[PDB]
């Protein structure tokens, strides 16, 4: 609102006072053009920002459906680790998700085998792997060490 | 002799009263 835009003054009262009417129309029309463009620029940049906010809102709706109301198997959608559940909290102009996840820890090293042969036939595990404690062989699940 | 004038010589630029602002002006200053 402060810029001249090539006219004689920013304020329209001085332009109307200092000149005759026919010259005043020509001087006012340049301010009118400049302010129209200064407003159209603002509208266009606001449209481009609203597109981005819509993208974030759609992703937040998907996360609310899949992470909060159910358990999600997609890798790194609902946080690092293996998803268990999630909790929503409100924030000004947004949302905050507290994802609770399971993180394995304290790895151990074992010897492993693809299959064992008992009497001329090969046995494969139904679920899990074969491990070797050092004394005898065992079958375990992959994520926890519970020998069977 | 010569000395230094550190942060001295600023004055009220004009007739206006303003509060709670950071106002940038261009005028003859020390």
């Amino acid at each position: 609102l402060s810029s001249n835009f090539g006219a004689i003054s920013s304020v329209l009262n001085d332009i109307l006072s200092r000149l005759d009417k026919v010259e005043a129309e020509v001087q006012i029309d340049r301010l009118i053009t400049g302010r129209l463009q200064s407003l159209q620029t603002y509208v266009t940049q606001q449209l481009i920002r609203a597109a981005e906010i819509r993208a974030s809102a759609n992703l937040a709706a998907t996360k609310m459906s899949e992470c909060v109301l159910g358990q999600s198997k997609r890798v790194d959608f609902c946080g690092k680790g293996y998803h268990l559940m999630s909790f929503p909290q409100a924030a000004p102009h947004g949302v905050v998700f507290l994802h609770v996840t399971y993180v394995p820890s304290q790895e151990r090293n074992f010897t492993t085998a693809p299959a064992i042969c008992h009497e001329g036939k090969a046995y494969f595990p139904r679920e899990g792997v074969f491990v070797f404690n050092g004394t005898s062989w065992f079958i375990t699940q992959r994520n926890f060490f519970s020998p069977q | 002799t010569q000395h230094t004038s550190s942060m001295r010589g600023v004055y009220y630029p004009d007739e206006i009263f303003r509060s709670d602002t950071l106002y940038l002006t261009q005028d003859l200053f020390l």
Binding site: - | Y12, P13, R18, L22, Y23, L24, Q26, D27, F29, L30
Partner: protein, 148 residues
């Protein structure tokens, strides 16, 4: 000296602090972002140029004074239906005696301002000379209609 300052106003209207924008890079940053505190990061402040250090003028090897005397002060000009074109080349033309003097009633120049004629440098100059009736001088202009 003429400098740019930024001044801080409290609630009662008194100046308590100020920064000088031409002192430091940091003061220019504080004037650019309009604050007395700055976060960590890299902020694009301004643009820089390098000012010139010299001057170079190169005009060719021309020494002859230019015959403007023969074109203007001559015994006979032809009539308008058969005008004459005279070529002027290889001369140093002062050009100031045309607009400094009060000899000429109309000195109207198109595409060139007369005051800048002394600086520009041309390939050839062509002078067309004729004699017209007193009201026919207005028809010597681009894009104009008449019998002449």
């Amino acid at each position: 000296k003429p400098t740019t300052f930024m001044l801080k106003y409290d609630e009662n209207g008194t100046i308590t602090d100020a920064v000088d924008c031409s002192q430091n890079p940091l003061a220019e940053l504080k004037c650019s972002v309009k604050s007395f505190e700055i976060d960590k990061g890299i902020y694009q402040t301004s643009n820089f140029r390098v000012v010139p250090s010299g001057d170079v003028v190169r005009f060719p090897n021309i020494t002859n004074l230019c015959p403007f005397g023969e074109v203007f002060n001559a015994t006979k000009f032809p009539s308008v239906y058969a005008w004459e074109r005279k070529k002027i080349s290889n001369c140093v033309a002062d050009y100031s005696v045309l607009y400094n003097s009060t000899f000429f009633s109309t000195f109207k120049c198109y595409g060139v301002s007369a005051t800048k004629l002394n600086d520009l440098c041309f390939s050839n100059v062509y002078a067309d000379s004729f004699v017209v009736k007193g009201d026919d001088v207005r028809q010597i202009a681009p894009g104009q209609t008449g019998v002449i």
